[PDB]
Design a protein around this ligand. Sequence first.
Ligand code: HEM
Ligand code: HEM
Ligand code: HEM
Ligand code: NA
Ligand code: NA
Lengths: 157, 157, 157, 157, 155, 155, 155, 155
Amino acid sequence: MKGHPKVVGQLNRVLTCELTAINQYFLHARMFKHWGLEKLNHVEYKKSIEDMKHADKLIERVLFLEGLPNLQQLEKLRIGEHAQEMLDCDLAMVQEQLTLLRDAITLCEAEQDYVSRDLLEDILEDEEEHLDWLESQRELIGLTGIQNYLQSQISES
Amino acid sequence: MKGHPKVVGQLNRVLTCELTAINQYFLHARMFKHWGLEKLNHVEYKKSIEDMKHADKLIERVLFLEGLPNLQQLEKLRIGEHAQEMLDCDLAMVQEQLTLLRDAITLCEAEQDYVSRDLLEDILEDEEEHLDWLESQRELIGLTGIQNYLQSQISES
Amino acid sequence: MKGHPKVVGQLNRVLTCELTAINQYFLHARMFKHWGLEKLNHVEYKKSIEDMKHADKLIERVLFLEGLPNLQQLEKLRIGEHAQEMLDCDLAMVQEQLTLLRDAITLCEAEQDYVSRDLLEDILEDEEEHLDWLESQRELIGLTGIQNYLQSQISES
Amino acid sequence: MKGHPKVVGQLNRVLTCELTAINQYFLHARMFKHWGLEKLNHVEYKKSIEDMKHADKLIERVLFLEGLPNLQQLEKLRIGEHAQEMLDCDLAMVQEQLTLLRDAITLCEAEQDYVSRDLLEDILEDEEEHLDWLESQRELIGLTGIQNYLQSQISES
Amino acid sequence: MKGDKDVIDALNRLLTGELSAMDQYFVHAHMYEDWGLNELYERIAHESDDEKGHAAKLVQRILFLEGVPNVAAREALNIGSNVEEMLRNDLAYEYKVADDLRKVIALCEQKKDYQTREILEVLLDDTESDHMYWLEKQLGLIDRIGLANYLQTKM
Amino acid sequence: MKGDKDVIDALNRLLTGELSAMDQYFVHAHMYEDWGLNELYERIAHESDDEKGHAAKLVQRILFLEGVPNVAAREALNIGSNVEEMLRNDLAYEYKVADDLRKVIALCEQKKDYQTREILEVLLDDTESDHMYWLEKQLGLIDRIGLANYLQTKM
Amino acid sequence: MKGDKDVIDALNRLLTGELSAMDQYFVHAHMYEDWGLNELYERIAHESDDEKGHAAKLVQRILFLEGVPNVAAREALNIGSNVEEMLRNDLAYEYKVADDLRKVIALCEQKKDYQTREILEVLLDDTESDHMYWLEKQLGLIDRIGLANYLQTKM
Amino acid sequence: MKGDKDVIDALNRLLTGELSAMDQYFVHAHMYEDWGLNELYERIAHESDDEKGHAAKLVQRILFLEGVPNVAAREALNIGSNVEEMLRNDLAYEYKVADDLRKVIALCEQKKDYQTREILEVLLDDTESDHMYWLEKQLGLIDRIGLANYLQTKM
Ligand code: HEM
Ligand code: HEM
Ligand code: HEM
Ligand code: NA
Ligand code: NA
C-alpha cells in the first residue's frame, strides 16, 4: 500500500531514534556488565532488545508503505561515565523519543494512517513504561542512596 | 586489564564494521520478508543476529581492555534493489570485513594479545562460513537460474 | 439370494472393467516409480488398491447373487509412454468406466436391485473423485507446464 | 501493641506452667521408652511437643504485648516411679494447668484482650483433650488391669 | 446503547463489504481447489472465514447499537478467470474495503463512538496486515519467479 | 466431467437457497444472542455453519461439472421480530429448501446424474433430520410449556 | 512523566466513578446472595472486581502522571430494593460511566495524551462490551420470559 | 435472622472502617509501586485485599441480620508522603480499627449475638496478628537498620 510521504518520513525519523536507542542501551548494558552491576545489565539489555523489536516493526511498516527504511543515519549517543549519568542520559533519550512519538501519532491521525498510529501507540506505551522504570530508579537512588542502590544491582536476580 | 592502544583501535574498527553488517543484514532480511522470500529472510536475520553476538563480544573485549567502544560510527551501507544485488552487496561486505579481521588478527599476534586473537578468530570463522554460504547461493543462481532460485526461498523451511 | 441375470451380467462387466483398471493403474504406477516420479507412483498405486477393493466388492456381490464372477476376461489396456499420455489413458478409462457404471445403476434401479445400486454408487463416487483428480492434474500441467508439474511429483510427500 | 500488665502476668504464669509441662512430659516419655512401653512414649512425646507449641505461642503473645517472657522459672515437677503414678502426676498437672487457663481466660475477657483469650482457649481445648485421654487411660487400667494395660503399650503402633 | 444513526449506516456499509468479500473469497478458494492449487484454496478459504468473523463482529455491533443489520444487500462480485486476475480482484477489493474502513473510523472519531472505532481498527489491521500485504507479496512473487513457478508453489 | 445443463441450473438454485439460509440463520443467531438467548444463538449459528458446508459442497459440485457457481444471487430473507416469528420463518424456509431439493433429486435421477443425486440426498437428509425436525420440536415445545418457559430454557 | 493537569482531573473523576461502581456492585452482589440468587451474586461480584481493576489502572496512571489519586471521594450510590431496580441502577450507572469515559477520551485526544487515551479506551471497551451489554440483555430477558422465570435462572 | 439494632450499627461502623482501610492501603500500595518499592507495594496490596475480605464478611453479616450495609460512607483517609509516614498512618489506622473492633466485640457479648462476636474476633485476630504486628516490626526495623537500608530491602 502506498503510504503518505509525511507518515513515511515520520516513521523513518522514529526509526533513526529507535536505532540510536538500541545502540545507546547496548553500550550502557555492557558498561554495566563491565562494572559487575548485573541487574542493570539485564534491564538495559532487555530494553535494547525491545527497541530492537520496535525498529523491526518500523522497518516493516516503512517497507509495507513502499518507503525506504533509513538504517544509515543515527543520532548522537549520550554515553554516561557512571550509573547515575547513564540513567539520566537514558531518561533524556526516552523523553525526546516520546515527544517524537507523540508528534508522529498526531500526524498519523491527521493522515488517517490508523495502523501506523496503532504501531506508534505500542511503541509509545513501551517507551513510557521504560520512562516509568527510569523515574523509579531515580527515586530509589534518592531514597536509599547511590551506594545502596548500586548494591541492589550486583545480582541479576 | 589495560590493553594495547593499537589492539583497541583495531577492535573498535572491527566493531564499526560488525555494526554496519548488523544494519545491512537486517534491512536486507526485511526487504526479503517484504517480497515473500521467507528462507532468505530467515538466513539474513540469523546472520544479523550472529553479527549482533559478534558486536557484543567486541564491545565486551574493548571494555575489558579499558577502551571506549565506538557504537556511534557506522560505515556506508550497500543496500541492493533485487535479490542478486543484495547478495552481491552482502558478499562485498563479508569480503571487506574478512580482510579487516585478518589485519586485526595479525596485529593482535604482533602485540601478544592472544585472547583478542581468539575472539577475532571466532569472528573470522563465522564470517567465512557466511562467505561460503553466499558463494553457494551465487553458484545456485548460476545453476538453476534466478527464478528457480527465488522460488526455493518462498518457504522458510 | 438369486439375483437378476441382467444385474449379474452388468456386475460382471463392471468387474471386467475394474480388473482392467487395476492392471493399468499398477503398470502406470510402476512406470512412474521407474522414472522417479514418486508422488505419481503413490497416487496411481492407491488408485489401483481402490479399484482392487471395488473388484472385491463386485466379486462378493456376484457371488451373493448366485452368479459366477468372471475374473478371466480383461479389456484392452491403454499404456502410455510418457506422463501426459498415461494420464490421458487413465482419464479415458475412468470416463468409459463411469458411463458403464451409470448404465449399470440405471439397470439395477429398473430391476429393484437396490443394494447392487448402492454398491455401484459407491464405485461411482470413487471413480468420479479420481476423474476429478485427473482433470486437476491436466489443468495443473496446463498451468505450470509439464516440466514444473513433473518436478512436483519427484517427492512422494 | 502494649498489652495489659495483668494479662501479660497471666500469660507469663501460663508460660511457666507450660514449660514445666514440657519438662515433665519429656521426662515421662523417656522413662516410658526406657521401660519398653513405646506407645506411652509416643503419646507423652507428642504431648510434650504440643505443650512446646503452646509455650511458643505464649512467648510470641507476651512479646507482641511488649512484655518479657519468663522462660527462667519452672514449677516443681511431679515425676512418678511407675506407669500409674506417672499418669496420675500428669493428670494432676493437667488439672492445675486447666484451672490456671480458666482464670487467665476470665481475666483476658475482663480486660477485653480477645486474641489472648482465643490463644488461651486453644490451649484449653488441647489440655482438656489430654485430660480426656488420661482419664481414658485410668479407666482402661481399671477395666483391663495394669498388666494388660501395659502390655498394650509395648508396641508404638 | 443507542448508537449514532450515521455510525450504524457506515457499519452496515462495512457489513455489506465484508459479506461480499466473503462470497468472493469463497468462490475464488473453490476455483483454486478445482485447479489443484490447494495452497491458494486454503489461504483464500481462511480469508473468507476471517471475513465471516469480521461480519459477525459488525452485526453484533449494529445490534448492540440498536440498529438493524443488513445481511441481504451484496455488492457486485468481481470474479477472475485466471489466478493473476483473481488475485488482482481480491487486491482491488481489499483496497476498497480499507478505504471504506478508514472513512468509517474517521466518522466514529467525529461521532465520539470510540468503541466502534476500535472494532473497525481491528478490522482495518486485519485487512492491511493480513491479506492486503499477502496479496501484494503474491503479486510481487509472480513478478519475480514467474507465473508457472508461482503456481507450482501453490499446489 | 461435463454435467447436464439442467442439473447445473438446479444445483445453482439450490446454492442460492443455501446461501440465503446462511444469511438468515446468521442474522437470527445474532438476534438471539442480542436477547441473551444463548442456546438459540448457538444452535442457529451452527445451522448457519451447516448451510455454509452445504453451499461448499454445491459449489464444488458445480465447478466439477464445469459450471459457474452463482454466489452473487440471493433470495429474499424473511427476518422475524420475535422468537416465534424467527422460528416460523426458519421453518418456512427449511420447507422451501426441502421441496426444492426433492425437485432437483428427481431431476438428477432423470438425467442419470447419480452422484449429484447422493450429494443432494445428504443435503436433504440434513435439512429434514437436522433442523426441520428440530424446528418442529421447538414450536411444539412452545405450544406445550408456553413461550416464557420455552425462552427460559434457551438462556 | 508530567501529565496534563486537565487529564489528571478527568482521570480522577473517572476514578471516583469506578470506585462508586465498585461499592454499588459490591452491595448489590451481596443483596443478590442474601436472596439466594447466586448467579447474579457471582456476576455482580466479578463486575465489582473488574471495577477494582479499572480503578487500579487509573490510580497507576494518575501516579505515573505525577498526580494525586483521589480515593476518598465517592459519588452517591443508587441502591435498588428489588432485582429489576438494582439492574436498572447498574445500567444507569454504566451509562453515566461510559458517557464520562467518552468525554475524557476526547480530552486525552485534544491534549495529545495518547497513552491515557488507550487506557481509557480499554476501560470503555469493558464498560460497553462487558456489562452494559450484559445488563441490557438481562433486562430484555426479564421482558421476554418474565421476572419469575428470569429469577429462577439466577439461582 | 433479626439482629440487634445496636449490633447492626456497630457492624456498619466497622464496615466504614474496613472500607476506608481498603482505600488507604490501595493508594499506599500504589504509591509504593510508583517509587519502585515493590515489596511494600505487594504487602500493602494484599492487605487491601484482606480489608476487602473483611468488608465482605461484614456486609454479609449485616444483610443476614436484616440490616442495610452502608458502603457509601467513608472515613477521612490519612495518606502519607514518605514511607515512614505511610507506615505510621497505616499503624494509627490499624490501632483505631482494633479499638473499635474490641468495643463491638464487647457489645456483641452483651447483646448475646455470639456469632457476630466470632466474626469480629476473626477480624480482630487478622488486624492484630497480621498487619499491626507487621507494621510494628517494620518500624522497628527502620529504627534498627536505618531508613535507607530498610527501603533497600523493599525493592
Ligand atoms: C550495537 C548494536 C547491536 C547489538 C550489540 C545487538 C545485540 C543483540 C543480541 C545479543 C541479541 C540476542 C541474540 C540471541 O540471543 O539470539 C539481539 C536480538 C535482536 N536484535 Fe540486535 N543488536 C544490535 C542492533 C540491532 C539493530 C540495529 C536491530 C534492527 C534494526 C536489531 C534487531 C534485533 C532483533 C529483531 C532481535 C531479536 C529480539 C530477540 O532477541 O528476541 N539489533 N541483538
Ligand atoms: C482380481 C484382481 C485383484 C484383486 C481383487 C486385488 C485385491 C487386493 C486387495 C483387497 C488388496 C489389499 C488392499 C488393502 O487392504 O489395503 C491388495 C493388495 C495388493 N495388490 Fe492386488 N488385487 C488384484 C490384482 C493385483 C495385481 C494384478 C497386482 C500387481 C500387478 C496387485 C498388486 C497388489 C499389491 C502390491 C498389494 C499390496 C500387498 C499388501 O496388501 O500388503 N494386485 N489386492
Ligand atoms: C522452652 C522450652 C521449649 C520450647 C518452647 C520448645 C519448642 C519446640 C518446638 C516448637 C519444636 C518443633 C515442634 C514441631 O514443629 O513439630 C520442638 C522440637 C523438639 N523438642 Fe522442644 N521445646 C522446648 C524444650 C524442649 C526440651 C527441654 C526438650 C528435651 C529435653 C525438647 C525436645 C525436643 C525434641 C526432641 C524435638 C524434636 C526435634 C525436631 O523438631 O526435629 N524440647 N521444640
Ligand atoms: Na521450477
Ligand atoms: Na419456569
